[PDB]
TrEMBL record:
Involved in copper resistance. The lineage of its organism: Bacteria, Pseudomonadati, Pseudomonadota, Gammaproteobacteria, Pseudomonadales. One of its GO terms (biological process) is copper ion transport. This is Copper resistance protein C. It comes from Pseudomonas fluorescens (strain SBW25). GO terms for cellular component: periplasmic space; plasma membrane.
């Protein structure tokens, strides 16, 4: 099933805002039903959409609509594998530009 093994700004990390967030899963996911939301102090931040540029479906990419100011953020995600199974989870990180 799709579980996260490596990530762009992993939990409890401190980074400059990323250009895009790249989540890597063991099982590939359908770009069409996967959904990711980003929140700042309990308020959602707009998302351009999400895509998979790689030939493989193991990499999932999300682009924020606006730059992130310094502070605490939470990412909430829902992923559907190509085997149609659904899984969800959440993690947090700090922007320290």
């Amino acid at each position: 099933h799709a579980h996260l093994k490596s990530a762009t700004p992993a939990a409890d990390s401190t980074v400059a805002a990323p250009a895009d967030l790249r989540l890597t899963f063991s099982e590939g996911v359908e770009a069409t039903f996967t959904k990711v939301s980003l929140s700042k102090d309990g308020t959602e931040v707009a998302i351009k959409g999400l895509e998979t540029p790689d030939a493989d479906k193991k990499t999932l990419v999300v682009t924020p609509a606006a730059p992130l100011a310094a502070g605490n953020y939470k990412v909430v995600w829902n992923a559907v594998s190509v085997d149609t199974h659904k899984s969800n989870g959440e993690y947090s990180f700090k922007v320290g530009q």
